[PDB]
Every structure is written in structure tokens, then in C-alpha cells.
């Protein structure tokens, strides 16, 4: 039933448009990639104060509808519709915990949902597409906020269409 809307009240599109996730309480920071520790490449998704407005995302469902509802399982990804190299997934890495990280592989059905919360929306991670969702929140480290499973402490976002491009 529940259609996800952008900051202009329009329905969020299935894959066709990109959107900024604008944190309601961390608006000084934008989505970016970073290392957690000593890994060779920056693949952890963070809110970084030095990047505004940050990397926009696309929400993707295999359903042949042109809008997104809160009940749909989604892939979330950086980059164009054509590329699958910025696809979000969740990977254990100390000391963050279950961190949101980009991969270059994509399942048909992604593990995320976008659900209403306070002024906006949270991202919820459903391991193995089960019935129980885990809130994505923030772990502060190295002057960045790492997106990570933090159940009960969701990061709240508003969704701004990136037509400015």
C-alpha cells in the first residue's frame, strides 16, 4: 500500500532516477565510501562531513512497476542503472560490526526496505529476506559515520531527487 515519496511529495522511481539520502539529524554529512581499517579499497558506506550532498542512490525492485513501496525488497546502489559495481550489502568488520559495504554482485531481490520513521525514512536490512528487519544506523569513527546494523537506533533520511544534475 505505502508509496515512498521524495522531498517534493512525488513517488520514488524504481531504478530510473537517483536520489540523495539526506540525514535529518546529520545534514552536514553526505553518503560516501571509506575504509574501516587497513583493507586495500574503500567499500564501506559512510556519512562524511567533507562530502555534500554525497553519492546519490537508486532503489531497484525486479517488479515491473515504476514506483517503490515500503513493503518492497530493494537493492540500493550507487552509480547508473547500467552498472552493478556499487550495490549495497552487509559484511561483518570489527570494530564497526555489521557494516553496509558496496559489492559488484547483485541478487534479483535485494535485502533492504525503506520504511517510514519520524520525519522521513529508515533503511531496514532483512538477512536472508526473512520476516525480521534490522535498522541501519550510524557508528561514529575516524570523523565519519559508518552505516551499520544498529537495531532500534535507525538513521532517519529524507529522499531528494537528484534532478539538479
Amino acid at each position: 500500500s505505502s508509496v515512498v515519496v521524495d522531498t517534493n511529495g512525488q513517488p520514488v522511481s524504481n531504478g530510473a532516477d537517483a536520489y540523495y539520502l539526506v540525514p535529518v539529524s546529520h545534514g552536514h554529512a553526505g553518503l560516501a565510501l571509506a575504509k574501516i581499517g587497513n583493507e586495500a579499497e574503500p567499500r564501506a558506506v559512510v556519512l562524511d562531513p567533507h562530502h555534500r550532498p554525497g553519492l546519490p542512490v537508486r532503489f531497484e525492485s525486479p517488479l515491473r512497476i515504476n514506483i517503490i513501496k515500503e513493503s518492497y525488497f530493494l537493492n540500493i546502489k550507487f552509480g547508473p542503472s547500467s552498472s552493478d559495481s556499487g550495490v549495497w550489502d552487509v559484511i561483518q568488520q570489527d570494530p564497526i560490526g555489521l557494516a553496509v559495504k558496496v559489492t559488484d554482485t547483485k541478487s534479483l531481490l535485494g535485502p533492504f526496505k525503506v520504511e517510514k520513521e519520524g520525519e522521513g525514512y529508515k533503511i531496514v536490512y532483512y538477512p536472508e529476506r526473512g520476516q525480521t528487519g534490522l535498522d541501519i544506523g550510524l557508528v561514529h569513527r575516524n570523523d565519519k559515520y559508518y552505516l551499520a546494523v544498529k537495531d532500534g537506533e535507525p538513521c532517519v533520511f529524507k529522499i531528494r531527487k537528484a534532478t539538479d544534475e
Binding site: 530510473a16 515491473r64 512497476i65
Partner: protein, 223 residues
């Protein structure tokens, strides 16, 4: 519809447009004077439904009707398991008078035949990523259950079947959900889902397997 063409106007008189604030989001199929069949994932608390359309402007379409509906019934097993049982019945506020441009269609009782060439119609995205001005038609062929389950593992369920994935890259796309797949003059399937992006070579789309649901549809509609 990817790599199709304009339907002959009113050649698909069962086609329904589901619109929300004057934007099309899904199609459906008139299966009874007072009921439209669509995908369960197209559910809304109320609908504006265009019948007898070709372009999406009713005032340019003699015989067209924009009708209201508030009641929908999703199949009780929708999404159990995930993506399966993707159908719902929408009851129109008023039954509709049959005409040359507005007519119901029967549902196939036989299950899809691999190799069968079928027609899919809708107002969803074109190859160029734009929305068409008029209803599009394309032919796609039913694929074997074996190819369907290989490609869509681990989510394949017998409430689904696959069609398309030819070399000519014909497919359904975003906005086509809930629209009809016609085989041998009967309603065989509804556009349900597929791989993003649409039209990939060798990748057929997935359709609701309506032969599995004729009793449920008949019992809901006769009530």
C-alpha cells in the same frame, strides 16, 4: 514494452490503465463487467481505472471510461513465498457496459505451452527509457519451466512462468506490471517481474501463471 510497436487502436479492449494523480503506474485486465485483474504488487487503497484507452487522454478516446474503484482482493498467498501468487481483483464501483472498445477476456484453463508466441501489451517504458504516448504490443515466446527456474533461482515458484528472452530483446518493462499476456486468444499471464534492466538478451520476463488461479478468480468474482 521493449521493442514492440503501437497496438492497433482498441485491438486489446480488456486492457485497463491504473493511474494515480494522472500518472500510469500499472495495467490490469477486464475479466468481468465489474472486475479488473492486476498484479497484487500494484495494490492501492483506491484506484482510477481507464477502460477503452489507446492514448492515456480519455477526452481524445471516444468510448473510453475513467472509473473509480476502492475495493481490491489480493490473492491470500501473495508473496508466500516471495514474489509468488502475484495477482489481485479490483471491484469497480459500477459494472461497465460492453462496447466494441471495452470487453472482458476469459482466462486460459490450460497451462502455458513452451514455444507458444504470445502478445503482451502496456504503457510501460520503451527501449529508449521514455514512456510511450499510446498502448504498445509485442510478441514474446513462452520458455520452458527448466529455463525459467534456472534463470530465477532461488525464487522460482509454479505460480510463475517465463516468456521472451529472444535475440530481438522483446520484453515487458517498468509500468507494464499487471498487464495481459495473451496466448491463443486467452489471458494466460500478468506482467509480474524480471531482471533489471529490462530487455537483456536471453533473459525472459516473469508472468503470473493464471491457469493456477481460475477457481480463486471465479469464486471471488461471482460472490
Amino acid at each position: 514494452i521493449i521493442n514492440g510497436e503501437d497496438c492497433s487502436p482498441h485491438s486489446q479492449p480488456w486492457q485497463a490503465a491504473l493511474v494515480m494523480e494522472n500518472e500510469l503506474f500499472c495495467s490490469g485486465v477486464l475479466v468481468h463487467p465489474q472486475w479488473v485483474l492486476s498484479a497484487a504488487h500494484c495494490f492501492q487503497n483506491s484506484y482510477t481505472i481507464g477502460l477503452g484507452l489507446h492514448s492515456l487522454e480519455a477526452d481524445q478516446e471516444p468510448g473510453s471510461q475513467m472509473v473509480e474503484a476502492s475495493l481490491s482482493v489480493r490473492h491470500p498467498e501473495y508473496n508466500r513465498p516471495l514474489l509468488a501468487n502475484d495477482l489481485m481483483l479490483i471491484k469497480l464501483d459500477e459494472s461497465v457496459s460492453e462496447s466494441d472498445t471495452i470487453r472482458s477476456i476469459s482466462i486460459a484453463s490450460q497451462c502455458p505451452t513452451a514455444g507458444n508466441s504470445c502478445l503482451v501489451s502496456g504503457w510501460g517504458l520503451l527501449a529508449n527509457g521514455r514512456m510511450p504516448t499510446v498502448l504498445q504490443c509485442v510478441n514474446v515466446s513462452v520458455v520452458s519451466e527448466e529455463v525459467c527456474s534456472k534463470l530465477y533461482d532461488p525464487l522460482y515458484h509454479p505460480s510463475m512462468f517465463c516468456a521472451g528472452g529472444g535475440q530481438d530483446q522483446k520484453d515487458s518493462c517498468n509500468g507494464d506490471s499487471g498487464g495481459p499476456l495473451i496466448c491463443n486468444g486467452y489471458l494466460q499471464g500478468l506482467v509480474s517481474f524480471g531482471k533489471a534492466p529490462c530487455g537483456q538478451v536471453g533473459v525472459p520476463g516473469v508472468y503470473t501463471n493464471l491457469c493456477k488461479f481460475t477457481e480463486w478468480i471465479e469464486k471471488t468474482v461471482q460472490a
